[PDB]
Structure formats: structure tokens, C-alpha cells
Amino acid sequence: DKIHHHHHHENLYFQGMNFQMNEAIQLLERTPKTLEVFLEGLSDSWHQCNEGYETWTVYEVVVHLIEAEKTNWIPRLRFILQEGEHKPFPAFDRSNAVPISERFKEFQQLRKENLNTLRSLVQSEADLERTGAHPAFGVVKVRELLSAWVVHDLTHIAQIVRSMAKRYDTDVGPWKEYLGILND
Amino acid sequence: KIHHHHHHENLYFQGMNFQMNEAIQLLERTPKTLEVFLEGLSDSWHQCNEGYETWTVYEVVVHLIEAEKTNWIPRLRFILQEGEHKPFPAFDRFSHLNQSNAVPISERFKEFQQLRKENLNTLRSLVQSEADLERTGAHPAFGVVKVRELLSAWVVHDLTHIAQIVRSMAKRYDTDVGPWKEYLGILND
Ligand code: NI
Ligand code: NI
């Protein structure tokens, strides 16, 4: 006789903290070489695609990643460790012509330097609990900044990949819907 | 001061962007991209998924290997040989053994690169002109399909599964990112 459960797998949709310094560094150290192998020597068509009107191009996403290496993660890590909660992070700020190959070189250099600084500043697991002040979010921990750093990379890789896939929305013909169905 | 109704409706009607050279550029890069991204990461990264009953990173790589044996090229051959007279088979009548997660992922990458390399040679043997792209066969449910539509679906398959791998890895830190969670869902800002 046929039966079911109410909200059968409710309990499964809850998650603890999985951050590990070593494991985070494994990802962070790979993103630049991954983007270079993937995108280098592709036709410019691929570098200029987006997910539609008023969304960033692939090239612009890589520039954005470079900008965060300069102005975002490491500067806020330093600020946490130096200012603690006594001051909120400062606001940020305050040429598409450059070959994408020059961008890859820059991102790889900045990332390499940033991972050396990371290692200098966070020298034990106990340091992951040190707190600073976000202008909107309130008290934030080092582990949360670094996690967001790893997730930020991944989020923009996926952004890049979906932009490229969108180029062929019409081209795939009747495969379009099924191409949205995963795990089958 | 006035506003428009459905201001950019007319911007949302996309044409066909497939070019053979550009398609092959991507397909030739996928194995080495997945290997440089995933090789030597902790097994934790390889076993992450997007939640209950979704595939692990490892399993997505195993599946891409299977697609290289079972899907794109065998269907291309069928289309070019049989045309629309006869639909190519659905996949639901030919089973495969579930494989061991115990095979080191390094071996899977080697296999995927080898099979992709072979498959791109075959593609160039079979599809030699623009006319060959306009050749039609018969999907057992969708009806008439063109070669360019199979090849385009192939490229998108790669990309869709790359995105699945990336999302599964990101998901691991859902709780870890703390108050950043909402904003990390907001793009182009
Ligand atoms: Ni961003
Ligand atoms: Ni698939």
C-alpha cells in the first residue's frame, strides 16, 4: 500500500562550518591558472559574452577579480587584525583594450602575493576567530572573510561559465530545457 | 517625467552564435581546465555536491567521461549515416555499470583528456563543411535536429557541468560565509 512522508528530507538541509585554511588556500591558489587555461587564446567572442543586457562580460568579470585582489580581501583582513571591532571597514574606491593575457598575468601575480600575505597574517587556527566590524553586517570573523573570498572566486567562475553557455541558448535547439536538468 | 512599458522587450531575441572553430576551442580546453582546477585538491572538494541526491564533483567528472563514450560522437555518426529516416536511440534502454569512486581522480582526468582528444579528431573527420552542420537527423522525442544543434548542445553540456562542479564547491561554505551569504548571490554590482 502506497505511502509518503511529509517534508521527507527536511533534516538534511542544514550545514555546519566546513572551512579549513589548507583547503581554502588550495582553491585560492588555483583560480588564476584555471581561468588562464580556460580562457587564454579563446576568440574574443567568448571574452565579450555576458548573461544578457546590463550584465558584465567575461573580460569584465576577470578585471573585477583583479580589482578585489588590490582593494578587497587582504586590505580587510589587515583591517580586522589591526583595528578589531573599534572601526568599520572603509568603503571601496573613495580599459577593455588591455589584452586578456595581460590580465591573467596580473591576477596570477596579485593572487600569489596575497596568499603570501594571508600566510603572514593568519598564523594559527585561533586567529580565524578574530573579529572586525563590517559597516552593514556588524561583527565579522576572519574565517567569514576568507570563506567569502573562496566563494567569491567560485561565484564569478560560474558567472563566466554561464555567460559562455548563454551564447548557445538558441543554437542548442530542443536540448535547451533538458540542459537545465542536472543529476539525471 | 514618463516611464516605458516593457522597455527592453526587443533586446531579448537571440540568434545563432555557433561557429565550428569557436566550438572546438572550448571542447578542446575542458579536460585540461578541469584537471588544473581539481587535481591535487583535498578529497573533500571532490566529494562535495549541491545537497541530497545531487552528484559529487567526482561523479560529474565520471559522467563527462561517459558522455564521451556514449553520447555526442555516437549520435553524430548516426545523424550523418541514417539522417531523418530513423531516430537515434534514447539512452534509457542501454544501461551502464555504476563505477567506483575509489579510482583516483587523476586517472579520470587522464581518461577524459584522451577520449576528448580522440573525439575531436573524429568530429573533424565527419564534419568537414558548413553544409555538414545543416545535416538533419531525428531525436526520438524532440523530432528533427541539426548537426550544429548536437555540437552546440555538446559545448553547453561541458559548461553546464563545469558550473555544477563550481556550485557544489561553493555550497560547502554556505554557513562559513556568514553575513556575506545574501550579497554573494547578487551579481553585476
Ligand atoms: Ni564580486
Ligand atoms: Ni549531463
Which domains are seen in chain B, by residue range? 6-186 (1.20.120.450)
What pairing do the DSSP bridges indicate for beta strands A138-141 and B136-139? unpaired
Number of Cβ within 10 Å of residue B147's Cβ equals 22
Determine contact, residues A180/A65, Cβ cutoff 8 Å.
no
Q: How far is CA A47 from the centre of its chain?
A: 18
Q: How far apart are CA A139 and CA B138, in angstroms?
A: 59
> In terms of Cα–Cα distance, which of B105, B97, B92 is closest to B43?
B105
Top residue of A18, A64, A65, A168 to mutate, by most chain B CBs within 10 Å, is A168
Q: How far apart are CA A23 and CA B83, in angstroms?
A: 50
**Count of pairs with CB atoms under 8 A, one residue in A, one in B:** 175
**Cell 585582489, residue?**
A69
The dihedral through the CA atoms of B84, B86, B88, B92 has a sign that is: positive
Resolved by = X-ray
Who's near A89: CB < 8 A, 6+ residues apart?
A: A76, A79, A132, A133, A134, A135
> In terms of Cα–Cα distance, which of A51, A25, A43 is closest to A117?
A25
Who's near B182: CB < 8 A, 6+ residues apart?
A: none
Top residue of B92, B152, B157, B164 to mutate, by most chain A CBs within 10 Å, is B152
Tell if the CB–CB gap between A170 and B16 is shorter than 8 Å.
yes
Tell if the CB–CB gap between B178 and A12 is shorter than 8 Å.
no
Q: What is the DSSP letter of A95?
A: -
Who's near B45: CB < 8 A, 6+ residues apart?
A: A23, A26, A27, B38, B57, B169, B172
Nearest CB partner across the interface for A151, out of B149, B153, B177: B177
Q: How far apart are CA B74 and CA B64, in angstroms?
A: 15
Top residue of B37, B46, B79, B155 to mutate, by most chain A CBs within 10 Å, is B37
Determine contact, residues B169/B57, Cβ cutoff 8 Å.
yes
Set of chain B residues whose Cβ sits within 8 Å of the Cβ of A12: 51-52
Q: What is the DSSP letter of A93?
A: -
| Helix or strand (DSSP H, E) at A134 | strand A131-134
Breaks in chain A, after residue numbers (C to N greater than 2.5 Å)? 94
Cα A35 to middle of ligand 2, angstroms: 22
Distances (CA, A) of B170 to A24, A157, B181: 11, 11, 11
Distances (CA, A) of B9 to A162, A167, A176: 22, 18, 21
Distances (CA, A) of B154 to A60, A109, B159: 26, 34, 9
> In terms of Cα–Cα distance, which of A125, A107, A133, A93 is closest to A32?
A107
Cα B183 to middle of ligand 1, angstroms: 9
Label residue A140 left, alpha or beta by phi (over 0 means left) and psi (-120 to 50 means alpha). beta
> In terms of Cα–Cα distance, which of B70, B68, B59 is closest to B102?
B59
Determine contact, residues A100/A39, Cβ cutoff 8 Å.
yes
Beta strands, E only, B51-178: 136-139, 143-146
Q: How far apart are CA B160 and CA A163, in angstroms?
A: 11
Who's near A30: CB < 8 A, 6+ residues apart?
A: B36, B37, B41
Tell if the CB–CB gap between B166 and A161 is shorter than 8 Å.
yes
Nearest CB partner across the interface for B17, out of A159, A168, A175: A168
Helix extents (H) in chain A: 21-39, 44-48, 58-71, 73-83, 100-121, 142-166
- List phi, psi (to 5°) of B136: -115, 140
| Helix or strand (DSSP H, E) at B38 | helix B20-38
Cα B130 to middle of ligand 1, angstroms: 40
> In terms of Cα–Cα distance, which of B156, B20, B125, B146 is closest to B75?
B146
Cα A27 to middle of ligand 2, angstroms: 24
Cα B49 to middle of ligand 2, angstroms: 15
Who's near B21: CB < 8 A, 6+ residues apart?
A: A43
Long-range contacts of A124-127 (CB under 8 A, 24+ apart): A125/A21, A127/A81
Cell numbers at A171, concatenated:
543554437
